[PDB]
Amino acid sequence: TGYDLSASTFSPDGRVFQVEYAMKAVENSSTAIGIRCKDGVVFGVEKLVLSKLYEEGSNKRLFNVDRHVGMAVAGLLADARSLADIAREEASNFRSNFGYNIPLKHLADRVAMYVHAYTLYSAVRPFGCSFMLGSYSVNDGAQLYMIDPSGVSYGYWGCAIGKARQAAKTEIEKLQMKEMTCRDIVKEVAKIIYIVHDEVKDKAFELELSWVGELTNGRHEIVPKDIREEAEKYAKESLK
Amino acid sequence: SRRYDSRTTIFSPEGRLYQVEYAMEAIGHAGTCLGILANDGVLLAAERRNIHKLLDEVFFSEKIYKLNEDMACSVAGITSDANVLTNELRLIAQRYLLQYQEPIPCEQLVTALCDIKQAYTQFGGKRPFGVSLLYIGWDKHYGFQLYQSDPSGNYGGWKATCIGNNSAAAVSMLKQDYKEGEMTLKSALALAIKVLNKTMDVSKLSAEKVEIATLTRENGKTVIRVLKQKEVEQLIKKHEEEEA
Amino acid sequence: DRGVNTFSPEGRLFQVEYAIEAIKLGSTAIGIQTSEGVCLAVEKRITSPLMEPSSIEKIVEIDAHIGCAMSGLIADAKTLIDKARVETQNHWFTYNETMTVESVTQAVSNLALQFGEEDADPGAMSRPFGVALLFGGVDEKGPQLFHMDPSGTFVQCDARAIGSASEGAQSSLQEVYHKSMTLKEAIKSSLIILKQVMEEKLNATNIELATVQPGQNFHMFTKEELEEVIKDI
Amino acid sequence: RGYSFSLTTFSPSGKLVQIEYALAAVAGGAPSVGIKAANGVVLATEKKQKSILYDERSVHKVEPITKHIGLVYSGMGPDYRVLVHRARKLAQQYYLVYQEPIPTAQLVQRVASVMQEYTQSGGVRPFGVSLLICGWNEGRPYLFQSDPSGAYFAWKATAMGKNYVNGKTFLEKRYNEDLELEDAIHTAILTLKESFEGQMTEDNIEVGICNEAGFRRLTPTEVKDYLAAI
Amino acid sequence: SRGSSAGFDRHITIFSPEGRLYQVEYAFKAINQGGLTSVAVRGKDCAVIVTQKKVPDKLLDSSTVTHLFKITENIGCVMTGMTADSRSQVQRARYEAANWKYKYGYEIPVDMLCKRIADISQVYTQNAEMRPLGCCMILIGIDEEQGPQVYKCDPAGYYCGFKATAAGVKQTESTSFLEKKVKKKFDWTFEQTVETAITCLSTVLSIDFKPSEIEVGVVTVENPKFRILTEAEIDAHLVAL
Amino acid sequence: TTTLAFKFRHGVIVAADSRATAGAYIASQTVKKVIEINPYLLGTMAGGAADCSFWERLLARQCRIYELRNKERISVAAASKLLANMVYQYKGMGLSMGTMICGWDKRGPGLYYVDSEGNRISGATFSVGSGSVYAYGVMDRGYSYDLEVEQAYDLARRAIYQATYRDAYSGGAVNLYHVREDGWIRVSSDNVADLHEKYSG
Amino acid sequence: AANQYDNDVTVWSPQGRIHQIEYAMEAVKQGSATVGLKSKTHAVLVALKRAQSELAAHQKKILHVDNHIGISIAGLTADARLLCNFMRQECLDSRFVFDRPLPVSRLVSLIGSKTQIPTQRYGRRPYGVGLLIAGYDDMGPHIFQTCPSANYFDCRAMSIGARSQSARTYLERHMSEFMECNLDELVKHGLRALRETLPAEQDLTTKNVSIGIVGKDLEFTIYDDDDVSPFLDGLEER
Amino acid sequence: SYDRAITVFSPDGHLFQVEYAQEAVKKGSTAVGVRGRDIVVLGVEKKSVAKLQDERTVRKICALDDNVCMAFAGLTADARIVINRARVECQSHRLTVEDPVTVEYITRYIASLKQRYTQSNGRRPFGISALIVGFDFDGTPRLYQTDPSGTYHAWKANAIGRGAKSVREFLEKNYTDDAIETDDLTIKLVIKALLEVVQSGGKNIELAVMRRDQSLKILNPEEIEKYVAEIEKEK
């Protein structure tokens, strides 16, 4: 009776309810898609601007961590910002400790087992934030990973987390995935974001993009700022 | 979580302690071993577990435990806890020696054990030590003396008090029979086998199903005897004839 | 039940809005800041007459120029009165001067909403301090009294009533004070205690009154001064 | 982290509710016999796995504590392995301070001492393994049993696990005080043979003896040898 | 004293009445969630590994999704539990392998590695305030003395020592097929393992796989390094059926 | 530094000089080397100018906490005792001080002597300081318990006048205190030169 | 039985809700109203102070933390003072170590990581206070609402407190005359934004209104009971 | 390390753990004391009824150092801790100021200690209540009565045992000025006050007196007997 409300207690069919209640707690938050291609990984985050009172970038949802990996986050921005800054401290301890710049698979496994080992105790709650990473070293490939509140981390190509990921996974699947040179897909990211945003009601879809690529050489930039007036010209493909 | 704690260290609305008087009912299930003092030394008189053959040899029994050259203790209630605490209090005895080069007058020891056992019922959220153990001893200050304690924490000089079941067979009858001035320890054995002869289901009260142990002396040093077998077959035929 | 660090379906904490109660329980104290002092009084509610009434400490001098007046759950204040005077002589020690009243009141009210179940070492507090008090003190700014809550909220006050008489005595005190001391605020405040009267006509055995005046340091009133005032009413 | 409140507590009747449940979990365990004999003991037990699929030379139930003291269980699986870990550690504290192999009685003192605080002390449930002890210790062999309460008793024969009333009554019938070597093994084999759930396979039993030269497990070619001599 | 529950029997890892602490079998039912299913092969000279692995949507990177982890240069492992609890368990096994090699010299043999992770899984299911994490570790490996071994610690800590037992989804049909197909040769050499390894999967769940969805990890006595196979050699292994 | 104190049948005189050296160069000719911890007691200082100033400062804090906490005037043996406790538990750390703790209480004139080693003795008279034994000599020639107030003042002025004349590490001024059952008062701020012309040597 | 999500900053409501650190957002909706805003040059803060007593300093809201990074509390007061002793102490620590003004964004981000820890762990209530911090770093004078849900907002012209939504909807439709509008006509434009949260009958008196100014070439300056009297105009009749 | 907050505010300002300690002192012995203006005097309920007691270790009358001594009432084993810590800090207050330690200060230490157990994390505030009697540097035979809420009162009878509301209203009635003499009328008032409740002092009552910072003397069956006799003769 009441097998809920504690992460150290299983269901009678083996399903820790404090994890799947955290999973819907990112399903009631906006989308943030990430598309891999051969020269790097392009992020794009939906924004749901509440009032006019918030200015541009009122809440960052494309954080960066180690001067090359990124942080497209979905759920609670407090929890996502917390694991963002301890990811910063984690790549800090790797670069300080081993000298070599952190390969992303080890960072995703490390933050993954951090947020997993944080779901084994009744003295803590699970995190309420799905998030994804992404970068490439000169010989790494465009590695990106995505991490659930359960703590599982998978390598993807075009993963999408948020509310409208039921819509968003279809267009990324029909987009040609492997062999295009990231500039077009920055442009094409707006087509996904304008399709999956199915409102006009007080959210304004004032999107935001960042990537890592051969135009960046392992960095992050908000776009630079010109595709915001070039990928804005993919209106009427959602209005027709 | 606060849904899970048993909350042992809570006063009742009637003011008492729920986990403490549940230990007092644990004594009445299993418990025997009265103790009688005299002008001479003091004895325990005890009962083993059952008739079950299948028991090879006890060096001392599971009941009477040696503590110093001049002290001993007997145990009621849950036997798993008290073993721990008696080794615990045994440590206390020896470290008094290490602090003072005295054989630890027994009231110091009973006070120390009752303070730590009170500390387990005071805080920490744990269950209290479910044993109302008692003590016999001697010091140069006072005479032969026995003390008796309980899982609540208080104690006393309890000149003929028994513990466990049948408080009336063992002990209200004793407070109509004990001569407080002089007792003459052989007749204290006789009164002990009287009370144990009334508090048993069987008349086979030999050392298969009894455990009596005395404390005496010779020339100053105390002697703790566990009253080996044939002495019990002596005292069991000391009726020959009647006791009540 | 639920714990101490939880918010209530009204809007507040549980233990804080429960700590506003047990202030209605307990004795009543009043204080009036004037332009040349501040007067404090408390009807300390003696139970039996078989006894000694002059050791119920409800007017406690923090320093020579800060006197507090507690009520509610009595003797729960002694840890934070101890922190008040230890912080006071720490201030005079490290800075070689007097204090304000908002520095002692700043320092005590930090300890009010500072508790919890699972925290640092068990010398911390579990329940909040269920004692409302007010520091009558004189400063180089001015005489003033700072009414605390058990919530850590402290406010500037010039006429404040605590205890069970926190509505009728406060509303009576709302209409009778505007001007200055001129010796009669202490006689128009025990008059409010005279309307409050629970057991006895407010003689010099059941009320404790003390003033803090800028010329002197403080004055805990003795018996003949009190019954000198009571004779005038 | 941690709880620091005891989950084992007193019933309103005045008894430990968790410990009788621990003796229930012991009584639902695999049956195991132990026979004290005039020079040495025998501690037999029953290893029935699910299928004929596993390595019967992989896990043991007879396993020594470092010198001449083996201990066999009945009940929970891995809580036993914790008690072997703690027991070996306590025997090596004793060996490094007193420079002799530990007397069996003192090892049962310390194993019963470590099983007591799991009837207390912060959220831990008691072990629910009433393992029994052997040992040659000088002159005459010893045998004990540490219940999940923390009590211990020495005797001449016992059984535990499933249907142990039949083991205690049957060993009460067939025991002699001089009955010493391999005859004890014989009656141990025909105490496990009493139920066994069928056919008495040598890979499903293992025995361990304390024949004045250290506790040692018996090789599977020796149990089947006396299974040929039934 | 059977249904007279002492309160939190199905909440905390404590004893219920009649024994049967109700968390480890609630943790056993956790390893059947989804179900990507391993079977263990034992070779008198080669411990092969088989498991099935299904990609959802051709959007996952199929190389990154696996179970098939490598503990050291001689010990591989595969686990079928909930994959959140998998990598927290395999990282501690790598930790105790490298800690064994730093602390006791030689590289750790396969048995007491599984004893040790079985023992920390025990202290998960002994203390409260932690759940016994639901993944079981089919792990193979060869030492110098004996043959190839295979082990599985459950989420209760009961490692056994198996001839070849794989638990995942459809554990009972698999071990029934292996039991019916090992009594033919109790000596059981079968280095090729072509009629045993994949055919347990293709006879239990009937897919008759293309060489994508199956992961195979061999060790051999002639080459004890743990090797994960690719679609070329597993494709020759499948057309050998 | 050369302090001095002696009790008699009217309270106790505490006198001290006013110079503060720095080895050989001297810092001030006017140093308040008597700490007024309350208007009932006093306390002197005899070396380690931040040590002694800090520990009678902190003694003033602790004794004021005793005044608030137990609503009584502090006994002088309590103040000297707790001073000896704290500077005892900094023994061996290079700490160097020494003082009178005089002052009337409910039993006597007081005058305890507490230093860095933790002596903590009662006394009839003392004079701690750098030279200071000069003061002992001249004070113990003219001391009696049956003195009145004025030649006790002249006994202190001549006493640490000669103790500042002969010693090098002393001088400056002389302040003098006569505490009794009202608290300390101040009776002097004279320097050495006006005493020299006052008494012709 | 009734609400098993009452033992509850560890638990999740089955939809998405953490069920009491949004209820701490209720606990700062209950607090007193305030309004801050920013210009192109200098940002201002304006607060009305509730008098739940005889009369008082009305529980002084806007606080000096800093050396130009000023705050405006709403909600609990002792918890607010704890949080500004934290913010205060490490702002002075950045004065100590780096010897520069601590930038406002890193300030509000690390308190956004300091009030985020009791939201995470067990048996510890969130800091139930809604700060409305405002300061002038190297670029333009920022202003940050942060919240007890540890989710700050780089906003401009925000109002939080009791019925402050009406002050927002005045202040949302009057953003066009920001990035101009100097101090004398800016704070008038903020007081007539505050003068809607009042219960439709009341002057912005000199007693209850305490404001704060921060920006180019001026310290974060508190205007109390006297100094708010040169700011006087309006009717609004509101 | 147990950290559950036990002593918590319920609704209507009621701190239930402390009032449960108030029944826990309502269900004890019947202790009583009289400040008799040159002497102080105690008395509690004899024992029960010794029969097989030891009178040496049935002491509700305890001595702190020499002058102050207390009679607890309730739970009789949580009290002995407070006895021990009272003796320890009492020796520490002989270490610092070196006085015949004043009774006010040690009863402030007891009340501050029990109030510190109404605050800490999970330790059940005591179920005792004291009668701190004694003297000081100048006579002044002050009596004090503490409380499980840590509130001490300097009253003059304070019968705070189990059937002692009748005793304190009796002592309200019958203590004005007739007990200002040396010992006899005071001790007669105490043994009259406890003979209101139970029965003869040959089995029940025991007392203790304290005179001017010397001779804490208990009264063997003799004292009690005499007291009872006198009381009966007067009544």
Work out the minimum CA distance from E123 to partner chain A, whole angstroms: 13
- Alpha-carbon torsion A125, A130, A135, A141, what sign? positive
Whether A175 and A37 have beta carbons less than 8 Å apart is answered as: no
Tokens 């205890």, residue located = C163
- If one counts every other C-beta atom within 10 angstroms of the C-beta of residue B216, the result is 15
CA dist D34 and H172 (Å) reads 75
Do D7 and D123 meet the contact criterion of CB atoms below 8 Å apart? yes
- Locus of tokens 């309160």: E7
Which region holds residue A113: left if phi is over 0, alpha if psi is between -120 and 50, else beta? alpha
Q: Which two tokens stand for residue F52?
A: 């002694």
Q: What is residue C59's DSSP assignment?
A: E
Burial H113-140 (b: 16+ CB within 10 A, else e): bbbbbbbbbbbbbbbbbbbbbbbbeeee
In this structure, which long-range contacts are made by residues A141-145, counting pairs with CB atoms below 8 Å and at least 24 apart in sequence?
A142/A36, A142/A37, A142/A38, A142/A39, A142/A40, A142/A41, A142/A212, A143/A41, A143/A103, A143/A104, A143/A105, A144/A34, A144/A36, A144/A41, A144/A104, A145/A104, A145/A105, A145/A108, A145/A112, A145/E64
d(CA A207, CA A193): 8
User: DSSP letter at B127?
Assistant: P
- Report DSSP letters for chain H, one per residue: ------S---GGG--HHHHHHHHHHHTS--EEEEEETTEEEEEE---S--SS--GGG--SEEESSSS-EEE--SSSSSHHHHHHHHHHHHHHHHHHT-SS--HHHHHHHHHHHHHHTTTSSS---------BB---SS-----BB--TTS--B--S----SSS-HHHHHHHHHS-SSTT-SSSHHHHHHHHHHHHTTS--TTTS---EEEETTEEEEE--HHHHHHHHHHHHHH-
How far does CA F72 lie from the centroid of its chain? 24
Residues 6+ apart with CB under 8 A from A169: A158, A160, E57, E59
Q: How far apart are the first and last CA of chain G?
A: 47
Encoded tokens for C135: 């520091």
User: Taking CB atoms and an 8 Å limit, are B84 and D150 in contact across chains?
Assistant: yes
- C74: tokens are 């009595």
Residue-range definition of the domain harbouring residue H101: 1-235
CA distance C221 to C218: 9
* Annotated binding-site positions of F: 49
- Copy the structure tokens of residue H160: 């705070």
Q: At residue A33, what are phi and psi to the nearest 5 degrees?
A: -95, 150
Round to whole Å and give the CA distance between C67 and C41.
11
Q: Could you tell me if B102 and B141 are in contact, meaning their C-beta atoms sit under 8 angstroms apart?
A: no
> Neighbouring chains of D at 3+ CB pairs within 8 Å?
B, E, H
CB of H148 within 8 A of CB of H18?
Answer: yes
On the 0-12 / 13-18 / 19+ scale of CB atoms within 10 A, A70 is: buried
Number of structural domains in chain A: 1
Domains and CATH numbers, chain D: 1-230 (3.60.20.10)
CB atoms within 10 A of CB B104: 22
Cross-chain residue pair H52–B174, CB shorter than 8 Å: yes
In the three-class reduction of DSSP (H, G, I as helix; E, B as strand; rest coil), residue A112 is classed as helix
Neighbours of chain C (3+ CB pairs under 8 A): B, F, G, H
Across the interface, do C63 and F68 touch by the CB < 8 Å criterion?
Answer: yes
3-state secondary structure of E116: helix
Q: Please, what are the domains in chain G?
A: 1-238 (3.60.20.10)
Helix (H, G, I), strand (E, B) or coil at F26: strand
- A and F touching (3 or more beta-carbon pairs closer than 8 Å): no
β-partners of residue C40 are C31, C210
* Burial of D98 (C-beta count, 10 Å sphere; 0-12/13-18/19+): exposed
* DSSP string for D27-93: HTS--EEEEEETTEEEEEEE---SSTTB-TTTS-SS-B-TTS-BEE--B-HHHHHHHHHHHHHHHHH
**Token pair belonging to B129:** 């030590």
Q: Which domains, from first to last, does chain C contain?
A: 1-233 (3.60.20.10)
Residue type, G2: A
Q: Domain count for chain H, please give it.
A: 1
Task: Name residues whose C-beta falls within 8 Å of residue E184's C-beta, 6 or more positions apart in sequence.
Answer: none
Residue H153, token pair as written in the block:
């009162």
Query: Residues in chain A whose beta carbon is closer than 8 A to a beta carbon of chain E?
Result: 3, 6-16, 19, 109, 112-113, 116-117, 119-123, 145, 148, 150-159, 169, 172-173
Residues within 8 A of D (CB atoms), H 193-232 only: none
| Surface-to-core class of residue G167, CB atoms within 10 Å of its CB (0-12 exposed, 13-18 middle, 19+ buried) | buried
- The alpha carbon of D117 is separated from its chain's Cα centroid by a whole number of angstroms, namely 20
Please name which of B79, B165, E81, F77 lies closest in space to residue A10, comparing C-alpha atoms: E81
Q: Given the structure tokens 């490094």, which residue do they identify?
A: D96
| Chain mean position to CA B171 | 13
Question: In the structure encoding, which two tokens stand for residue G63, read together?
Answer: 């606080």
Cα separation, F46 vs F97, in Å, equals 6
Which chains form contacts with chain A, at 3 or more CB pairs under 8 Å? E, G
C147, C29 in Cβ contact below 8 A? no
Q: G102 with G92: CB under 8 angstroms?
A: no
Q: Do G72 and G62 meet the contact criterion of CB atoms below 8 Å apart?
A: yes
Binding residue positions of F for bortezomib: 49
Query: In this structure, which amino acid lies at residue H112?
Result: S
Question: Residue written as tokens 């999973």?
Answer: A23
The candidate with the shortest Cα–Cα distance to E237, out of E38, E48, E70, is: E48
Q: By C-alpha distance, which of B117, B118, B70 is closest to B97?
A: B70
**CB contact, 8 Å: G121 with chain A?**
yes
What is the rounded distance in angstroms from the CA atom of residue B38 to the CA atom of residue C82?
56
Residue E142's CB is within 10 A of a number of other CB atoms, namely 24
Pair of tokens at residue G171: 């202040």
CATH code of the region B1-244:
3.60.20.10
Number of neighbours of residue A240 by Cβ within 10 angstroms = 5
For A42-65, letters b (16+ CB in 10 Å) and e give: bbbbbbebebebbbeebbbbbbbb
DSSP letter assigned to residue A228 = G
User: Which two tokens mark F75?
Assistant: 């006994």
The CATH number of whichever domain residue A49 belongs to comes to 3.60.20.10
CA F65, CA C90: separation in Å to the nearest integer? Answer: 10
Catalytic residues of F: 1
Residue F97 · residue F115 · CB < 8 Å: yes
Helix ranges, chain D (H): 17-27, 77-98, 104-114, 164-173, 183-192, 220-228
SS3 helix, strand, coil % of chain C, rounded to 5?
25, 20, 55
**Encoded tokens for B90:** 């045994």
Q: Quote the DSSP letter at residue C12.
A: S
| Measured distance between the N- and C-terminal CA atoms of chain B, rounded to whole angstroms | 58
| B6 Cα distance to chain centroid | 30
Contact C2 G78 (CB under 8 A): no
> How far is residue A153's CA from residue A163's CA, in Å, rounded to a whole number?
19
Taking the C-alpha atoms of residue F64 and residue C135, their distance in angstroms, rounded to an integer, is 19
Helix (H), strand (E) at residue C111: none
Task: Name residues 115-174 of chain E within 8 A of A (Cβ).
Answer: 128-131, 133-134
Looking at the complex, report in whole angstroms how far the Cα of residue H51 sits from the nearest Cα belonging to chain C. 37
Tokens of H219: 């009264």
Q: Residue G3's CB: how many other CB atoms inside 10 A?
A: 10
Task: Kindly report the nearest CA distance between residue D171 and chain B, in angstroms.
Answer: 9
Residue A161 CB burial class (10 angstroms; 0-12, 13-18, ≥19): buried
Of the candidates C62, C215, C78, C72, the residue with the CA atom closest to the CA atom of residue C146: C62
Tell me how far apart the alpha carbons of residues H82 and C56 are, in angstroms, rounded to a whole number.
23
Strand D132-133: give its sheet, edge to edge. Answer: D71-72, D132-133, D144-145
Partners of residue E135 in chain A, C-beta under 8 Å = none
Comparing CB atoms, the residue among A59, A78, A123 nearest residue G119 is A78
Phi, psi of D145, rounded to the nearest 5 degrees: -160, 120
Chain B partners of G7 at a C-beta cutoff of 8 Å?
1-3
Structure tokens at G32: 């007193």
Cβ E182 vs Cβ E188: under 8 Å:
yes
**What CATH number did the domain enclosing H20 receive?**
3.60.20.10
Using the Cβ of G149 and the Cβ atoms of chain A, whether some distance falls under 8 Å is answered with: yes
**Integer angstrom CA distances of residue C22 from E139, H4, H10:** 64, 22, 10
For H54, the token pair is 């030891």
Give yes or no for E143 touching D (CB within 8 A): no
Q: A173, A167, A211, A213: which is closest to A193 by C-alpha? A: A167
Instruction: For residue G143, give the amino acid letter.
Output: I
Please state whether A162 falls in left (phi above 0), alpha (psi between -120 and 50) or beta.
Answer: left
- Burial group, residue H57, by CB count within 10 angstroms (0-12, 13-18, 19+): middle
User: At F155, phi and psi to the nearest 5?
Assistant: -70, -35
| Domain limits for position A194 | 1-240
Query: Under a CB-based contact definition with an 8 Å cutoff, are residues B22 and B6 in contact?
Result: no
Cα separations in angstroms, E112 against C213, D214, E151, E161: 81, 24, 10, 11
CATH value of F1-201 in 3.20.20.70, 3.40.50.360, 3.60.20.10, 1.10.10.2120: 3.60.20.10
F68 with C61: Cβ contact below 8 A: yes
For chain F, the domains span 1-201
- Report residue E159 as tokens: 């490692």
* Residue E60 to residue E50: CA distance in whole angstroms: 21
> Where are the extended beta strands (E) located within chain B?
34-36, 43-46, 65-66, 71-74, 134-138, 144-149, 155-157, 211-218, 221-225
Write the single-letter amino acid at C121. Answer: D
Size of interface C-F (CB pairs under 8 A): 19
